[PDB]
Amino acid sequence: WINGDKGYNGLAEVGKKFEKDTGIKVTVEHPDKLEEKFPQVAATGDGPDIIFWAHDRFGGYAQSGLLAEITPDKAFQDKLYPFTWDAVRYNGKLIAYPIAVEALSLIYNKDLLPNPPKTWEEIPALDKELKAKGKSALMFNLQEPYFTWPLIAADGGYAFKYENGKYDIKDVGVDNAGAKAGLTFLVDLIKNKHMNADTDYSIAEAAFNKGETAMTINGPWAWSNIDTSKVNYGVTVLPTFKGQPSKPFVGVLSAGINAASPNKELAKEFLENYLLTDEGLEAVNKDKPLGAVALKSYEEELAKDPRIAATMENAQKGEIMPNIPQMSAFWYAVRTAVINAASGRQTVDAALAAAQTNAAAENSQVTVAVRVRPFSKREKTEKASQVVFTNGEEITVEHPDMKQVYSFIYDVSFWSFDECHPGYASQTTVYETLAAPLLDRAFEGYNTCLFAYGQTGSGKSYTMMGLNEEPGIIPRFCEDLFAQIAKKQTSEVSYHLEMSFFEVYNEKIHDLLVKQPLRAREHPVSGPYVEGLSMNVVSSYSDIQSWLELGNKQRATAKSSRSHSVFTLVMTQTKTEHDHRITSRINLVDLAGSERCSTAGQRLKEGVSINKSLLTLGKVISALSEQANGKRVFIPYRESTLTWLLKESLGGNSKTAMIATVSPAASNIEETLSTLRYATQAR
């Protein structure tokens, strides 16, 4: 499997010669969303033996365990440029053969510009000239980092520090000086009207191919269209910046072998000894040009064409495009950086500082727990029957009709149904398993949320607060916390806790530690905050308990809870003249009874607003989960007050968790299924 845009029958020719030498016939096909279908089909132990695609999507298949560990000897590795092998490396395993190589180059109008500039610094001057003569120095696509990054990386920007065939996921080069200088100089071109911020791909292409501008930046795909344009063009090295080369992301067309294929040995023989040779690549190139190639020997032939030469010069000076899931997060962080600094609505420093922290953001998954409580007094009186069960991980709902069985897996399932059961879940168990780690995250400097989700009676309060005979999460957490402060607090580090306790009622904010509506506002770095919310210093749990008593006295009636209570602990961790502060927000949120209890006043507005608010929470949480698995999505924080307020404590580097409580009873099976399905929403 190779692409349709490539040279298929040329590759078939190399297979048509493989049969001759071996006797084994060749499999060359170019089907469909081949890249999108390959993981669909390779996942079930099918697909082709060999797949040809760019290394972009190869990093994923590898993670999915889909490609085999290739095993060329050094002798063979030495035949291709050493940098190309970094493309086809995942989790420190060689997982494909580099084939072709692709990179942005400087493209210029020989007629307008016989001697193109070596140097970015030249362009303003160059431009001033061409504009006086009714033309322009340079137009390229300023909309997307793929194109802008090269200049940005020149003085030292980088996406993820790559060392031991490892990308330090945590080491990002978007904030740094090298990146500031590139973006700054870029932005200046714009400021000084040497380029337009609105310039995208088509404008740029149109302009260059019509003879309106002297220069553009594009990749070999763009050549053909110039050819048709009859514009007299040259393709060359990108300009230096601060005497350092521009660093475009390199795209390596690479050939991997299916982990499923039994032809692993035969495939290797084919790629190494047939395809990857002067003859073998010429066969393909002749059909449809490979651009620059990884095979040193043949590239040297190809680089006779100085356009190709230059794709190579620039690929080598560039950086292999990371095939990791975090690249997305990077792409979008930097896109937004550049858009806003080019706009002038935001300084370079602030743009890139914002982008660093989005590109470097953990995006940890949301932890979902479930707890099934014992039969309530009321349910026993109702002669209630069990409809909820455990099996191993799985919580299973078996409808009385016995046709309907719904099952669910959460990160953890707390089975507190029968105080007996060899896996019964006590209060301590619930704490140690779900919340303790949050406290460890809080101490590491991460913001955290614990949401408590369920219908009235399902055990939210029991779980969160508890009773003197049986203390729930909040009390244990605080006493864990304070005992750890005691431990940790030293002449090196100091701990300070403040506490706010508010509620979201009908999307309004009410402070429970004093009912007037407080206004939400937003800081552009530190995010949403409540204007006029009390922050009471705390020193022990007893302090908090006072406060949570005062607060809960003023929360919500029916006795159902009809607001979302937000218990918050801001903890400042001051070390020392030279003394930083590390801030963790800890939000413990008792959500409102999920009952969609809709029958026959302002009690209704509540219901409406609770359903709406909880739906939005779920949406964002769901978005979070998807985000955490690396896919670009929109997170509707702003769509609900609770979610907007906790924005900075939800995503980013934050640690979010939810405990859904349910009733084991047949009476409640529908709300139980609402809850459990909700909690799945959250993966």
Ligand SMILES: Nc1ncnc2c1ncn2[C@@H]1O[C@H](COP(=O)(O)OP(=O)(O)O)[C@@H](O)[C@H]1O
């Ligand atoms: N996991 C549990 N194990 C034993 N009893 C529970 C459990 N959860 C709730 N209960 C019992 O049910 C009562 C009501 O619990 P509660 O958490 O207030 O539900 P909600 O907070 O949603 O109203 C508690 O006082 C307790 O006796």
